[PDB]
Structures are given as structure tokens and as C-alpha cells.
């Protein structure tokens, strides 16, 4: 099968490399699994030394961390909008590390309502700051100091926030990501 040895390559001088042995299991490679988007489907791979790798063939949900608010919420994945390596990965909705995806910010908005008493999905969000169990007014003044990037708010109101997958679904069998923020969101939004 696929091999990862360097005996089949050429030297840095361009000279061909001759053969002394045959293929061996130490340099064994495995067929890639392109984790698409859909119904959950994972497989167990017996790796070397008996350890087990979780090969995620298809996934739909994932846990995403909001860095600023210090929470992590499970969420359904909607679409893959930008893959920095191959444009084919955008159409096929292949889940890989560093793939900018879109998820519905329902639990994050719900968490924000309970934790804060306001709703990001409100188009009058900044106006609702000026206009006011009853101790939520103490928390109310945190936003008159800290602000969100505009592109995040548009995703909240449109129901599609941008997140970056930060795990290896073909190795760990799961999608772990994080919501993009100030400097990263501007860069990745101009790409789209």
C-alpha cells in the first residue's frame, strides 16, 4: 500500500535512488478519509502498537469555544466557506484543520441571554445597551467598556457565525473549533 519512506525519491543532486529492500510496515501509509458533512459516521482504526485512531468519515456537530466569553458550546455545522489549501474542499464540505466553517449561533445566543439578559441577534443591540434577578444591571456595564467586532454581530443576526476547525477529524474523530475574532475575522472575511 501507500508508503512514506524516502527510498523511492531522488537525491538532492537529482540522481535516481536504487533499491536494496522491499516495502516494510514501518513506513506504511493509510488511505486518507475526507470527512464530509452529514450524518455521524466514524470508524475505529487499529494503529501501530495496538492503539486506536477514530476515523471520522462524516460529522455534523462540533464543540466550539468563544475565546472572549470563555465558554464552549456544542453546535451544528452549516457550511464550509473557505479552505486555505484547496478550493475543491469548499464545494465538497470536507472537514479538516483550518477550514473556516459556518455554524448556527443558537446556544451561544441562548447562553448570552441567560448569562447577560440581552440578545446579540437583536439589530438594536448597541441601542439596547443605553436603555435598560435585578442585579443584571451590574453586569450591564461590562459592554460599555468591551466591544465586539462588527462582522461577528452580522453573523449572529444572519444565523451563521464563522469558526475555524482546530482539531484533526480524521485522527481524533471530532470537530473542535473556535469562533473567529478581531484580527482573524477581518482577514478571513476579506477572503470571502
Amino acid at each position: 500500500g501507500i508508503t512514506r519512506d524516502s527510498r523511492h525519491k531522488r537525491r538532492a543532486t537529482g540522481g535516481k535512488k536504487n533499491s536494496m529492500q522491499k516495502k516494510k510496515k514501518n513506513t506504511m501509509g493509510r488511505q486518507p478519509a475526507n470527512t464530509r458533512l452529514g450524518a455521524i459516521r466514524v470508524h475505529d482504526v487499529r494503529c501501530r502498537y495496538g492503539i486506536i485512531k477514530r476515523r471520522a468519515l462524516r460529522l455534523e456537530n462540533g464543540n466550539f469555544s468563544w475565546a472572549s466569553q470563555s465558554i464552549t458550546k456544542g453546535t451544528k455545522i452549516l457550511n464550509v466557506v473557505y479552505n486555505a489549501s484547496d478550493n475543491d474542499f469548499v464545494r465538497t464540505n470536507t472537514l479538516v484543520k483550518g477550514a473556516i466553517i459556518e455554524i448556527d449561533p443558537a446556544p451561544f445566543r441562548l447562553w448570552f441571554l441567560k448569562f447577560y439578559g440581552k440578545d446579540i441577534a437583536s439589530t438594536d443591540y448597541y441601542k439596547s445597551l443605553e436603555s435598560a434577578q435585578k442585579k443584571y444591571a451590574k453586569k450591564l456595564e461590562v459592554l460599555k467598556n468591551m466591544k465586539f467586532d462588527e462582522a461577528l454581530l452580522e453573523g449572529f443576526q444572519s444565523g451563521r457565525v464563522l469558526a475555524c476547525i482546530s482539531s484533526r477529524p480524521g485522527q481524533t474523530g471530532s470537530v473542535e473549533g473556535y469562533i473567529l475574532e478581531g484580527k482573524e475575522l477581518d482577514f478571513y472575511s476579506k477572503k470571502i
Binding site: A67, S68, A84, S85, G98, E181, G182, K183, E184, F187, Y188, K191
Partner: protein, 78 residues
Amino acid sequence: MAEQTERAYQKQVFHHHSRNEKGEIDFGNVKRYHKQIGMGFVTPAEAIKGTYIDKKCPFTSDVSIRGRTLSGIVKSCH
């Protein structure tokens, strides 16, 4: 501003946010990470003050310097 010339976003291996003057984490900036390599080598000023991003730089990444150490003269810079 000038180092983001690739398709992906360029970040250091250890990118961390610095605290605000009020004493809490400010998520609006990233600390420029730089370390000191070992056996009597000084870290250049550009590794401290510069804004370049490199994941293989011995001063701004997690690549270590191991036992073998040689000297030579530059041949090509292409």
C-alpha cells in the same frame, strides 16, 4: 499587515493575549513571543522587535537547537 501574504492566517506557535492596564486579559492584541536559545547565543533585535511570522525560527518558535553546531560561508541566497 505586511506578513499576511498567504492564503491562511499567519500566527505564532505560542500566541497569547496581553493584559490590559486594568489587570485583565485584553483580547484585542497578541503578545509577540520570543525565547532565548542555549549555549551562549544572543537573540537578535529583529526577533524581538520585528513583526515577521516564522514557525521554524529558533528564536520565535518551538524549534530547539541540539548538539551538533557547525560553521561555514553562505553560498546561495535564492
